[PDB]
Amino acid sequence: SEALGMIETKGLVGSIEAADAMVDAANVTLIGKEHVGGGLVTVLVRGDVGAVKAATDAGAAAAQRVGELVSVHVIPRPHIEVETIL
Amino acid sequence: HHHHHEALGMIETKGLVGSIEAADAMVDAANVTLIGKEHVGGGLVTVLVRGDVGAVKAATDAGAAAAQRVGELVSVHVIPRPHIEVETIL
Amino acid sequence: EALGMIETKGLVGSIEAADAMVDAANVTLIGKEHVGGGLVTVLVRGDVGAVKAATDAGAAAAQRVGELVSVHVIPRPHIEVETILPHS
Amino acid sequence: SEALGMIETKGLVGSIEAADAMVDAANVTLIGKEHVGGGLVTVLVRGDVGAVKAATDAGAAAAQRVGELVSVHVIPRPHIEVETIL
Amino acid sequence: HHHHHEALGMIETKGLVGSIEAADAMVDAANVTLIGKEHVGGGLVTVLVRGDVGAVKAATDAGAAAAQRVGELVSVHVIPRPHIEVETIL
Amino acid sequence: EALGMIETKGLVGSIEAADAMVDAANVTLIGKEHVGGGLVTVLVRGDVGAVKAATDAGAAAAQRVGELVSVHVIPRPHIEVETILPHS
């Protein structure tokens, strides 16, 4: 159960910049991006807890510089059931 | 038409992050099954769980509190005995 | 058959409206429609009396958990309107 | 080139009620309904000018009673090119 | 990359009614071809026309005024010599 | 290659941004993405210098006809980011 990191922005540009800054900051896997309507876009990463925390911190700061940051969160040990909605 | 003669728990958020956190907290809090998530546009996302009523109430209480900390909570509800017809819109 | 509809902002209000409608009267839940902006409509069909009882119960239930936008009953819809509705 | 009548609402309920009131008020053809996002829904009718004006007036009043009316308009003699976006 | 070595007119509205009225007024005002309409979500709708620059300017001016009377006008623009690459997003 | 992006509220601002970008420099217009809520992004690829010139021109052009939301250049995108981008 690898850690899960997520950044949500209003607008795609902030999310693409967040994804690039996340993989630049640490060895994390980019799971993908999700569009939920209303302009909201989420990018998600997986990896060891330390790497996910470093990646999400870098991604949140990068997204805030170019777009609108909405949320930033890390789940260090997600439950296996959560994989069914990722 | 009732199933017998399981309870449904739901949390709706504005944004996916609050829903992923709600889903994780729900399955962590009690013996419930995560049924899935629905996007209805306008940024609204709903995550649904099934199980015995006591487990669904404990899971939704934990999921509502968790979603509010990281995102925007919109609704939280438990239907103890949902009609089978409601499955057609889940 | 009469047509009953409840529109909410958010899916949770619509799931609760649909459950309260089928619980209150013998109506057929046709389904749900998403029109964007968070708006969701649930539609039922049945005899006029059943549809009125179901929609009244559904509207009150939806308002408790979410945001009720509209509630309406068309007792005898024109056949042309069926061409723009969802069907079972 | 039959007249074109249109009613736009915020929400589907107002548009279904508008469509029923339009066909109830006059001999018009319901072309269909369109969802453009943001909750906006448009219902369109065709027929002779007099019938379309009566139908759209009835549909606007009916939609306003149950939902949110946004726009109401009649084009008495639409250009043939407009059929390509209907 | 230019087409030669036609002009594009566009009107964006919030709601379909303003766009249908803009399209009708545009083709009525001048010799332009209605290319189509695009929905981008959030209620925004764009209608596009092609023709000689003078015709496109006359058509967009008429369409902008007509859309504002019945709905919500958001944008109005003419590109006299659009690059062929822009066709990939029209 | 460098990646340039311009996000607007409305399609008109994005069509004008795309035209001004290809007019200003030799960049490849990858396409456009709609993420809901009226937000539209247009993306270009090319050498860093060309992408910076194109995005600067596109941002100024989009602001004149519509609502500019974001403008950004990533000079050397990580290979992983290509998996979430549109491609030609």
Tab-separated table of N, CA, C and O in Angstrom, chain A residues 1-2 4 46 75-84 86, chain B residues 23-29 34:
chain	number	residue	atom	x	y	z
A	1	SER	N	0.805	-1.226	0.000
A	1	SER	CA	0.000	0.000	0.000
A	1	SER	C	0.843	1.283	0.000
A	1	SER	O	1.051	1.889	1.056
A	2	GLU	N	1.302	1.701	-1.186
A	2	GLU	CA	2.090	2.914	-1.353
A	2	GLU	C	1.273	4.168	-0.958
A	2	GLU	O	0.052	4.185	-1.108
A	4	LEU	N	-0.375	7.908	-1.233
A	4	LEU	CA	-1.080	8.558	-2.319
A	4	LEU	C	-1.003	10.056	-2.108
A	4	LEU	O	-1.287	10.535	-1.024
A	46	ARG	N	1.765	8.173	-6.626
A	46	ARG	CA	1.964	7.091	-5.649
A	46	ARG	C	3.464	6.930	-5.450
A	46	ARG	O	4.249	7.121	-6.378
A	75	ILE	N	-2.242	10.761	1.616
A	75	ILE	CA	-2.743	9.676	2.433
A	75	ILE	C	-1.551	8.702	2.539
A	75	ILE	O	-1.242	8.024	1.565
A	76	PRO	N	-0.853	8.656	3.686
A	76	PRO	CA	0.349	7.799	3.783
A	76	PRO	C	0.130	6.311	3.562
A	76	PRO	O	0.979	5.658	2.973
A	77	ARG	N	-0.985	5.768	4.050
A	77	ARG	CA	-1.251	4.342	3.902
A	77	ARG	C	-2.722	4.144	3.526
A	77	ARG	O	-3.562	3.891	4.388
A	78	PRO	N	-3.053	4.321	2.239
A	78	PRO	CA	-4.458	4.182	1.824
A	78	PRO	C	-4.974	2.769	1.915
A	78	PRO	O	-4.214	1.809	1.737
A	79	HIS	N	-6.269	2.630	2.217
A	79	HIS	CA	-6.878	1.310	2.255
A	79	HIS	C	-7.025	0.767	0.835
A	79	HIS	O	-7.289	1.532	-0.104
A	80	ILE	N	-6.796	-0.550	0.666
A	80	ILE	CA	-6.845	-1.223	-0.627
A	80	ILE	C	-8.150	-0.947	-1.380
A	80	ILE	O	-8.119	-0.788	-2.591
A	81	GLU	N	-9.286	-0.803	-0.655
A	81	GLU	CA	-10.581	-0.528	-1.289
A	81	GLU	C	-10.584	0.761	-2.088
A	81	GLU	O	-11.293	0.857	-3.079
A	82	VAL	N	-9.779	1.757	-1.662
A	82	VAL	CA	-9.705	3.055	-2.338
A	82	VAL	C	-9.150	2.935	-3.766
A	82	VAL	O	-9.522	3.722	-4.639
A	83	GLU	N	-8.331	1.895	-4.038
A	83	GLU	CA	-7.816	1.656	-5.393
A	83	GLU	C	-8.956	1.508	-6.416
A	83	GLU	O	-8.783	1.853	-7.581
A	84	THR	N	-10.136	1.030	-5.978
A	84	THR	CA	-11.276	0.839	-6.868
A	84	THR	C	-11.869	2.157	-7.407
A	84	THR	O	-12.611	2.127	-8.389
A	86	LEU	N	-9.654	4.963	-7.900
A	86	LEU	CA	-8.537	5.728	-8.417
A	86	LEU	C	-8.433	5.587	-9.941
A	86	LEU	O	-8.803	4.546	-10.490
B	23	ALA	N	-13.688	8.522	1.087
B	23	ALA	CA	-13.723	7.082	0.805
B	23	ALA	C	-12.729	6.334	1.633
B	23	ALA	O	-13.090	5.319	2.241
B	24	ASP	N	-11.487	6.853	1.742
B	24	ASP	CA	-10.475	6.189	2.552
B	24	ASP	C	-10.875	6.142	4.024
B	24	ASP	O	-10.745	5.092	4.660
B	25	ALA	N	-11.380	7.280	4.565
B	25	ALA	CA	-11.781	7.305	5.971
B	25	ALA	C	-12.982	6.399	6.240
B	25	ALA	O	-13.080	5.817	7.333
B	26	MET	N	-13.889	6.266	5.287
B	26	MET	CA	-15.067	5.413	5.446
B	26	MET	C	-14.699	3.921	5.557
B	26	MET	O	-15.115	3.242	6.512
B	27	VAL	N	-13.900	3.420	4.608
B	27	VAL	CA	-13.477	2.021	4.646
B	27	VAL	C	-12.559	1.731	5.832
B	27	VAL	O	-12.573	0.605	6.337
B	28	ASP	N	-11.804	2.736	6.294
B	28	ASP	CA	-10.935	2.587	7.461
B	28	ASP	C	-11.754	2.497	8.740
B	28	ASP	O	-11.363	1.793	9.674
B	29	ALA	N	-12.850	3.265	8.829
B	29	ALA	CA	-13.631	3.337	10.058
B	29	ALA	C	-14.492	2.141	10.360
B	29	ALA	O	-14.766	1.897	11.532
B	34	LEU	N	-16.819	-0.129	-0.559
B	34	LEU	CA	-16.851	1.074	-1.389
B	34	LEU	C	-17.459	0.690	-2.745
B	34	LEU	O	-16.870	-0.111	-3.474
